[PDB]
Amino acid sequence: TITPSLKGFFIGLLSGAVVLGLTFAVLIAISQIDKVQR
Amino acid sequence: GGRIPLWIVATVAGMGVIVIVGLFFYGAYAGLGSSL
Amino acid sequence: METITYVFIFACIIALFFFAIFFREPPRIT
Amino acid sequence: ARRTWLGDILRPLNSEYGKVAPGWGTTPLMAVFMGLFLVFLLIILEIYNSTLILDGVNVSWKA
Amino acid sequence: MEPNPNRQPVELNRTSLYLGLLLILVLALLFSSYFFN
Amino acid sequence: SYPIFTVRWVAVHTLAVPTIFFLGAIAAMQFIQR
Amino acid sequence: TTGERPFSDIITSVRYWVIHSITIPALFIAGWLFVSTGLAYDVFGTPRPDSYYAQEQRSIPLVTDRFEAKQQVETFLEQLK
Amino acid sequence: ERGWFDILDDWLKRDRFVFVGWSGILLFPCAYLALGGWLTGTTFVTSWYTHGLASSYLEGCNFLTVAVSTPANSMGHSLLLLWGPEAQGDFTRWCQLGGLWTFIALHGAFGLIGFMLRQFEIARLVGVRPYNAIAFSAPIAVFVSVFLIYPLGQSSWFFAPSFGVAAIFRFLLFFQGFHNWTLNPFHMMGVAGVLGGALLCAIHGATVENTLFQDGEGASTFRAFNPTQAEETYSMVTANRFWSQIFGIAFSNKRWLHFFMLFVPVTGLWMSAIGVVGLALNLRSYDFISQEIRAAEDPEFETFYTKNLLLNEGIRAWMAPQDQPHENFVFPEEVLPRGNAL
Amino acid sequence: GLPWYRVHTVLINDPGRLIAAHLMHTALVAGWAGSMALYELATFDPSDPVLNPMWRQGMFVLPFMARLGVTGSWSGWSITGETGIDPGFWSFEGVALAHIVLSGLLFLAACWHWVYWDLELFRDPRTGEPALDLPKMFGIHLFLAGLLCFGFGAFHLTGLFGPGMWVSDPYGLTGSVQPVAPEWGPDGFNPYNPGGVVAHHIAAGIVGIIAGLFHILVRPPQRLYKALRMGNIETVLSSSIAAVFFAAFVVAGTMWYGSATTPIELFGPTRYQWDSSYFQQEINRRVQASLASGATLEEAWSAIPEKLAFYDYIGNNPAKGGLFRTGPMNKGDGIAQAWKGHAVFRNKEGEELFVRRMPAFFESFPVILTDKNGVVKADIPFRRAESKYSFEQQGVTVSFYGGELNGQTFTDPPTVKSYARKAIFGEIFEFDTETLNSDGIFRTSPRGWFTFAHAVFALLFFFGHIWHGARTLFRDVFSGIDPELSPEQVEWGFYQKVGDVTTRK
Amino acid sequence: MEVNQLGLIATALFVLVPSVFLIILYVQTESQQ
Amino acid sequence: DWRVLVVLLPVLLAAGWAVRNILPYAVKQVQKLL
Amino acid sequence: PLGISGTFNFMIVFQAEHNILMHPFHQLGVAGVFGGALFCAMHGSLVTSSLIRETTETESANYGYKFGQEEETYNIVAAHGYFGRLIFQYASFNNSRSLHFFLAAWPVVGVWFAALGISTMAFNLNGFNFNHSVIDAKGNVINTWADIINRANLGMEVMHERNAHNFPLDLA
Ligand code: CLA
Ligand code: CLA
Ligand code: CLA
Ligand SMILES: CCCCCCCCCCCCCCCC(=O)OC[C@H](COP(=O)(O)OC[C@@H](O)CO)OC(=O)CCCCCCCCCCCCCCC
Ligand SMILES: CC1=C(/C=C/C(C)=C/C=C/C(C)=C/C=C/C=C(C)/C=C/C=C(C)/C=C/C2=C(C)CCCC2(C)C)C(C)(C)CCC1
Ligand SMILES: CC1=C(/C=C/C(C)=C/C=C/C(C)=C/C=C/C=C(C)/C=C/C=C(C)/C=C/C2=C(C)CCCC2(C)C)C(C)(C)CCC1
Ligand SMILES: CCCCCCCCCCCCO[C@@H]1O[C@H](CO)[C@@H](O[C@H]2O[C@H](CO)[C@@H](O)[C@H](O)[C@H]2O)[C@H](O)[C@H]1O
Ligand SMILES: CCCCCCCS[C@@H]1O[C@H](CO)[C@@H](O)[C@H](O)[C@H]1O
Numbered sequence A: 001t002i003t004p005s006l007k008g009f010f011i012g013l014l015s016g017a018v019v020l021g022l023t024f025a026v027l028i029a030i031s032q033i034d035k036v037q038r
Numbered sequence B: 001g002g003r004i005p006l007w008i009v010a011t012v013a014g015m016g017v018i019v020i021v022g023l024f025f026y027g028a029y030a031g032l033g034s035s036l
Numbered sequence C: 001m002e003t004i005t006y007v008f009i010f011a012c013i014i015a016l017f018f019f020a021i022f023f024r025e026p027p028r029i030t
Numbered sequence D: 001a002r003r004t005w006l007g008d009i010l011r012p013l014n015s016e017y018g019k020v021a022p023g024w025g026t027t028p029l030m031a032v033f034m035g036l037f038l039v040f041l042l043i044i045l046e047i048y049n050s051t052l053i054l055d056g057v058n059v060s061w062k063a
Numbered sequence E: 001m002e003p004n005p006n007r008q009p010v011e012l013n014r015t016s017l018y019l020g021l022l023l024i025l026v027l028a029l030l031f032s033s034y035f036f037n
Numbered sequence F: 001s002y003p004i005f006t007v008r009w010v011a012v013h014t015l016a017v018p019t020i021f022f023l024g025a026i027a028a029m030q031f032i033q034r
Numbered sequence G: 001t002t003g004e005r006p007f008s009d010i011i012t013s014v015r016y017w018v019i020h021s022i023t024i025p026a027l028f029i030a031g032w033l034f035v036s037t038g039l040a041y042d043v044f045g046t047p048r049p050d051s052y053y054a055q056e057q058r059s060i061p062l063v064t065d066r067f068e069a070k071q072q073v074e075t076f077l078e079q080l081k
Numbered sequence H: 001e002r003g004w005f006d007i008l009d010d011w012l013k014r015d016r017f018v019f020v021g022w023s024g025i026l027l028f029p030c031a032y033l034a035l036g037g038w039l040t041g042t043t044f045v046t047s048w049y050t051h052g053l054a055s056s057y058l059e060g061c062n063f064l065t066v067a068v069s070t071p072a073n074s075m076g077h078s079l080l081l082l083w084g085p086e087a088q089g090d091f092t093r094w095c096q097l098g099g100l101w102t103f104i105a106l107h108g109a110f111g112l113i114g115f116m117l118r119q120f121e122i123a124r125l126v127g128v129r130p131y132n133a134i135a136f137s138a139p140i141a142v143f144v145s146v147f148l149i150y151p152l153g154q155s156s157w158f159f160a161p162s163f164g165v166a167a168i169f170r171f172l173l174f175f176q177g178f179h180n181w182t183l184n185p186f187h188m189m190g191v192a193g194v195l196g197g198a199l200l201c202a203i204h205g206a207t208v209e210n211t212l213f214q215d216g217e218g219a220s221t222f223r224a225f226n227p228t229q230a231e232e233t234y235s236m237v238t239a240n241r242f243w244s245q246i247f248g249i250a251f252s253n254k255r256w257l258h259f260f261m262l263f264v265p266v267t268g269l270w271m272s273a274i275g276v277v278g279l280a281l282n283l284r285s286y287d288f289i290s291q292e293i294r295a296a297e298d299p300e301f302e303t304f305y306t307k308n309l310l311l312n313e314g315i316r317a318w319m320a321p322q323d324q325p326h327e328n329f330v331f332p333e334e335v336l337p338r339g340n341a342l
Numbered sequence I: 001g002l003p004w005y006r007v008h009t010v011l012i013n014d015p016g017r018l019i020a021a022h023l024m025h026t027a028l029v030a031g032w033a034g035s036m037a038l039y040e041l042a043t044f045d046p047s048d049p050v051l052n053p054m055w056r057q058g059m060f061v062l063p064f065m066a067r068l069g070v071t072g073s074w075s076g077w078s079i080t081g082e083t084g085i086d087p088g089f090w091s092f093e094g095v096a097l098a099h100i101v102l103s104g105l106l107f108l109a110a111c112w113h114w115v116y117w118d119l120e121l122f123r124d125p126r127t128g129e130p131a132l133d134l135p136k137m138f139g140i141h142l143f144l145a146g147l148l149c150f151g152f153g154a155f156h157l158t159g160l161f162g163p164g165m166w167v168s169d170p171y172g173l174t175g176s177v178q179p180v181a182p183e184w185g186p187d188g189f190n191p192y193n194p195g196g197v198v199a200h201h202i203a204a205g206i207v208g209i210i211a212g213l214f215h216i217l218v219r220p221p222q223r224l225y226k227a228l229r230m231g232n233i234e235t236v237l238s239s240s241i242a243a244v245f246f247a248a249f250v251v252a253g254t255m256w257y258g259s260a261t262t263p264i265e266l267f268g269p270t271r272y273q274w275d276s277s278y279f280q281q282e283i284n285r286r287v288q289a290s291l292a293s294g295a296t297l298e299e300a301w302s303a304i305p306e307k308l309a310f311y312d313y314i315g316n317n318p319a320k321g322g323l324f325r326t327g328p329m330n331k332g333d334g335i336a337q338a339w340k341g342h343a344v345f346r347n348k349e350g351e352e353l354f355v356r357r358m359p360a361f362f363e364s365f366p367v368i369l370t371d372k373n374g375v376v377k378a379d380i381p382f383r384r385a386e387s388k389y390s391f392e393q394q395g396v397t398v399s400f401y402g403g404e405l406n407g408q409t410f411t412d413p414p415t416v417k418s419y420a421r422k423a424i425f426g427e428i429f430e431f432d433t434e435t436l437n438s439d440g441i442f443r444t445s446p447r448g449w450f451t452f453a454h455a456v457f458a459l460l461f462f463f464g465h466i467w468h469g470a471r472t473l474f475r476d477v478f479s480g481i482d483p484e485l486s487p488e489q490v491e492w493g494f495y496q497k498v499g500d501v502t503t504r505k
Numbered sequence J: 001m002e003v004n005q006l007g008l009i010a011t012a013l014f015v016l017v018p019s020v021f022l023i024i025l026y027v028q029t030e031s032q033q
Numbered sequence K: 001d002w003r004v005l006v007v008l009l010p011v012l013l014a015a016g017w018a019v020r021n022i023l024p025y026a027v028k029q030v031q032k033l034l
Numbered sequence L: 001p002l003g004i005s006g007t008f009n010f011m012i013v014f015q016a017e018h019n020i021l022m023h024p025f026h027q028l029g030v031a032g033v034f035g036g037a038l039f040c041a042m043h044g045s046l047v048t049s050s051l052i053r054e055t056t057e058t059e060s061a062n063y064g065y066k067f068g069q070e071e072e073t074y075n076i077v078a079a080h081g082y083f084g085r086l087i088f089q090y091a092s093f094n095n096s097r098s099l100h101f102f103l104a105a106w107p108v109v110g111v112w113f114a115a116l117g118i119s120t121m122a123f124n125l126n127g128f129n130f131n132h133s134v135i136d137a138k139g140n141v142i143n144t145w146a147d148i149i150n151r152a153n154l155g156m157e158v159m160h161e162r163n164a165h166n167f168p169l170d171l172a
């Protein structure tokens, strides 16, 4: 079965993925908008 | 740009720090944490 | 034997001070 | 340098110093395996830690 | 046999001798009490 | 002509905004009585 | 030299103080009310001065079970009322 | 060519007021949460359910007595994640169970990793050797041995240091009474490295400032330095003669001098970390067996070593009931060790 | 010349002499293992696996031979206490001999590779320069590691072709070497399940074979080759050291907390078994089951195995030692001879009293006796003038059930107090303190010593990783920074991107 | 006092082995060139 | 919870007041970037 | 006492009788020596990191400096360029005289306060005393970490010089 702590483990995993995904999405977006001039 | 002289900003900010820290020392003698 | 050991090590250190000071490699302006 | 019978047999295994695949190559695939490995270590850590508790998995000498 | 081209001379100057002997002797003065216990 | 919002602006306010809020909270605490 | 506006320009400008004569006192008052309304106690679970002990108890409510620790605290809290 | 990775690399390494870098993706969230966690706990959060202690400004503590305290001993070495099986996602209970302690310790650990990666990253970008990152391994060895390895060897996180001024002082005194940590030669080397480092700091700064060349007309001499100048601003030759005649030996090689300033405090902290790894297992330098055998048979034999053990025995008996509440110690008055009158 | 701390860098561009130095290191380690086993065999007393097992005797490599199936001596004894056993060649002595012979052969190979360092195999065919293709070497070695890993699990641990591994019951009473089947469900990740060890080596070995084949056949991406400096052997040293300190922390952890690969009959019990009264609870359970079946009190306690009672004693707790208290545990409290039996303390009113046990933190601890509800009923006072709970005032007696003292009762306060002092240590034993001139001070077990050494080495290898990683990535500035370093690279706002000349503003 | 009987040779080799290592290296530096 | 809105409204009115004063210069900063 | 364990005896008794850990002059002392060790490692690492290349891979970089040479042996502009980016530009010293003055002043001032801590606790003006400072609505004492410190201090107090006191207060 899926125990409460396995459900908790999935929640923590998804939370970290969301935090990391949003972070890199924002950073990639800004980096593309404000490019260095060469 | 620069209309408010920096020495006034520093003086007022510094006085604000003295007031708030002074309040915290007052609270050491009154209410919670006062031993009374 | 313990006391001899402690005093021996100490004596070696004092001798080392003597050599490190009076028989150092002399500093030379190059 | 000295040639030997065994050295001649092994020569092809030490002949491609510096050879690379172009660009990023299999880096994306590598990253996926690293991520899976990280989750694997997190799972076994949390089981040992009793932060992840699974049916039929009694983390004790009484296993 | 043909000589090895990777060989290098090694050096320890007098100051390093003195520093090293001080380290060893002081470590000995420190740890000896625990060795005798 | 300077930008207003920068990385520095963000870093400054992640510290300054909670600090003032916390200082107001600790100020109120000085008047708590058991 | 890194492109951002110098701080000494910013904090001596009229516009800075038009904004921050509002935002700084507003945050300070918000923090004050966080305590004075009692909300801080309930967010963090900190005992009020009348909530460390029931009237006659003198034993601390120490958590002693790892996996039912949440229910233990809840039981400790019910014994206050 | 310039893919999204290189475009991101560009933005991360922009020369701005606060440098970010790839390492900043790890460093800034973790450092901010560790510091913010500490300020949040010391301002608002109790230790009543884990220690029987008040520990926040909200309860009446001051800056010296606030702390974010370790979890209860019954938690063991639980990661105590907010979504874990103990708090079950309840933020208030998580705070009451000590969740902020592992939050700060763990985000602090990854923040320290991020900071050392920052030292490498910046050194690589500006073109210097990475000795600042190397020297930072000593702070990391201390943090990891004291806040992680030591409690991991003990029964639980409860016995790690709690994050507070007075809480740390308690940690020092616990280590004296229970571990006799002052007697430990790895601590002694740590002391020598810290005090020797402070000595080197003071003597080097004072020596430079008192062998300066006159490079200006001012009686305040700081303006007579130019960062781009090629010349040494003080006389190594005069400094060397002074110390040779005062102390017997003196530096003569500036490169050796500054390496030695790295070596001494860095090595000392590393040694202290090794001793704490031993104390994780109660592998103490607690006693000298020869002393104990003599003292047990000869009631007139007394040294400062036996005197300090009596202090330790007092510390243990008098602090343990309140410092270790999970043990439910009850020590009747008559069993407490006490000298005459006191 | 080279400073003393760099002498070994002469091997960096000399693969044949690097192999020679590695052979010599391997010879030394194998010779250490052989010598260590011989020293242990010369000192190990096999006559009592119950109260004088290997972990009371300071044995460090003996448990590692036993863990993987070497349990007997050519002289006829076995560590489980059997007689007239024939272990074949692979006795403790044969293992030791094999390591000594291996050592010698590796020494001779080292001499050959040192003299004949200039092999064409070590030259890049295109440039004639010394070169090792480290990415392909990694695939070769990973494939070999996977084959060995798989074979160890599939043949040795299963007993399909090999002896199996040490396994035991939850209280470390009936351990032996057994074949172990792999556990393929989630309980295979339970550290206390031996079947998980078997499944790990089968599955990780197969993965190692597959990844080894990948690394033989697929070249590194240019981006990674450049970033990790894969033409520089010091990058392999840096990352290998990192893998090794990870492994050292893991084995330190599993030694301290216990697992299926650190059994208590080989390394001693854990500190957490004392913390939780693990053995005391099982002892009480068995005694209660005996009473419920109609046994008398003497019969119930006499039914407790001495081996089980011995685990319930703080002198076997690995968290009771000292860094400079050297040697076997027997050197401290003595060589255990016999269980004295279970002490039951009673006051003059006949209430049973319980001695408060010593926690591992305390070098010394008071003597305090409570009733079943934790109320203090007797103690040994420090100050006497206002004593209320002295054994004399409370008429404390002690009766023993099971063991040597079974059926006896003591009432004189000095004797009762003496047994109460021993009861803070748990179950009470008779020790031979004379044979070894034991000094009465607790020492840790091989579980403690192993954990200490490997946590310390792991921490130090973190520095080695940092150091060699730095040397790898900063090789170009190892001797100093550019004498012509333009101040514009370090001035702010000159370049848009730090250290990138093409971003001049 | 009942000291550890291996403490004497432990201390002696602790001093002598690394000290002679350094002396060997020093003297052969002086004798060069 | 009335207390949450009582605490957040000071900050809400602050953010609202700051946006009103900086909006023309904010849209000007962002317009330069694109 | 003039000895290693005698030093520890002095420290433990001092804590029992003056609560020196809770005294701000001892706390400044700790900032002085922790900070001194920190800045020692910092300055050492920064100068070492910016040594100008004068040697080959197979010799100590220390031979790149010659006693009495007139030119500086490291690039202070590079060191500041590193440290100013590690934190931020204005947190870093670009003036070597300012830097070395700071290296002198920080440990010296901190150790002055350490010395003054001992010298004023010599007249029994002791560390902060927050024993039973936190009290609940009824008046129950709510312990803080200061109260745990107090229990440890008591253990030291009652045991030290176990045969020397005849009367209930240790007044010197
Ligand atoms: C670099 C930034 C960073 C890092 C390294 C950490 C690290 C940590 N955090 Mg912190 N945190 C951060 C930023 C960070 N945090 C930010 C920005 C916030 C505000 C939102 C927080 C708020 C926060 C809280 C409230 C808590 C933590 C906690 C933790 C600890 C446990 C984390 C965990 O188990 O996640 C596991 C998740 C991952 C490792 C992500 C892996 C992603 C993989 C590789 C991709 C796969 C995803 C997968 C497809 C999703 C499928 C789900 C589906 C199957 C259901 C760990 C030390 C906990 C703690 O400290 O306990 C005491 C805790 O309670 N963090
Ligand atoms: C992983 C390494 C390891 C471990 C865990 C063990 C564990 C054990 N050994 Mg074995 N042993 C080992 C390696 C190991 N050994 C090696 C390499 C040898 C060959 C020398 C031996 C030879 C050996 C013998 C002959 C005996 C043992 C015995 C034992 C048992 C008692 C241990 C003891 O009293 O240590 C005490 C530990 C210490 C006192 C710690 C020393 C700490 C050092 C001195 C610190 C040095 C600091 C350094 C100088 C600082 C420099 C700093 C600088 C950088 C500035 C224990 C089971 C004994 C036994 O019971 O046999 C049955 C026994 O008689 N061992
Ligand atoms: C796989 C492990 C490993 C290997 C193969 C190397 C290899 C190397 N190291 Mg690294 N290193 C390591 C781990 C390793 N190291 C660890 C764990 C640390 C932290 C302790 C370091 C810290 C380090 C530093 C600071 C330096 C090196 C340097 C070097 C290079 C020259 C070494 C030399 O000539 O020493 C000569 C050594 C001696 C003549 C005597 C050393 C005596 C020791 C201190 C006491 C006795 C040790 C004892 C026998 C150890 C027994 C085994 C142990 C596991 C218990 C060489 C490439 C040097 C370098 O980079 O050169 C450019 C250098 O400066 N290493
Ligand atoms: C370069 C030479 C400097 C000479 C003085 C040296 C004195 C010694 C330095 C010690 C004092 C330290 C304080 C400097 C004080 C000083 O010298 O003042 C001078 C400095 C310059 O102000 P200006 O108005 O000139 O600003 C101009 C620049 O912003 C334009 O690029 O003022 C500040 O930097 C305020 C700091 C706010 C910083 C808040 C940012 C928060 C970000 C958090 C992240 C930090 C780093 C994270 C990494 C972990
Ligand atoms: C934990 C947590 C978190 C986080 C949070 C945060 C991030 C916070 C922050 C916070 C903060 C960030 C705060 C701050 C505060 C501050 C303060 C409170 C300050 C004070 C100060 C003072 C009081 C000053 C003093 C002084 C000094 C220091 C020196 C000189 C002078 C004087 C004396 C003035 C999250 C949500 C993620 C999740 C859950 C958990
Ligand atoms: C040649 C040959 C041979 C012979 C061989 C042999 C006889 C060998 C032996 C070998 C050996 C017999 C070896 C040994 C080794 C050892 C070692 C290698 C050791 C080391 C040690 C150490 C390293 C230690 C350290 C330490 C100390 C001392 C203290 C404490 C801490 C520590 C642990 C760190 C034969 C017949 C086969 C034939 C073929 C040829
Ligand atoms: C019990 C503790 C024992 C510890 C023992 C430690 C042993 C240490 C051995 C050091 C070996 C030194 O190795 C020695 O190096 C020197 C240079 O340094 C070499 O010397 C070589 O270089 C020098 C200097 O250019 C030339 O003048 C010389 O003609 C040439 O042969 C020697 O050929 C070699 O024998
Ligand atoms: C999370 C960062 C590490 C993984 C980086 C993998 C890059 S993957 C790589 O990326 C390029 C753009 O950057 C593409 O143009 C290219 O086609 C793609 O193969």
Ligand SMILES: CCCCCCCS[C@@H]1O[C@H](CO)[C@@H](O)[C@H](O)[C@H]1O
Binding pocket: I334, I414, I415, I418, I419, I422, I429, I430, I431, I432, I433
């Ligand atoms: C009647 C008082 C003396 C006998 C009982 C005292 C505790 S029992 C006693 O304890 C000693 C130390 O553990 C052991 O060496 C010895 O074998 C054991 O008999």
Ligand code: OEX
Binding pocket: L013, L017, L160, L161, L164, L170, L171, L172
């Ligand atoms: O002499 Mn040394 O110590 Ca100064 O307090 Mn009183 O006196 Mn004795 O008691 Mn506590």
Ligand SMILES: [Ca+2]
Binding pocket: F033, F034, L137
């Ligand atoms: Ca009231």
Ligand SMILES: [Ca+2]
Binding pocket: I437, I438
């Ligand atoms: Ca004897």
Ligand SMILES: [Cl-]
Binding pocket: H307, L009, L013, L159, L160, L161, L162
């Ligand atoms: Cl005393």
Ligand SMILES: [Cl-]
Binding pocket: L164, L165, L166, L167
């Ligand atoms: Cl008196």
Ligand SMILES: [Fe+2]
Binding pocket: H204, H208, H258, L043, L047, L100
């Ligand atoms: Fe300097």
Ligand SMILES: [Mg+2]
Binding pocket: B026, B027, B028, B029, B030, B031, B032, B033, B034, F029, F030, F031, H060
């Ligand atoms: Mg107050």
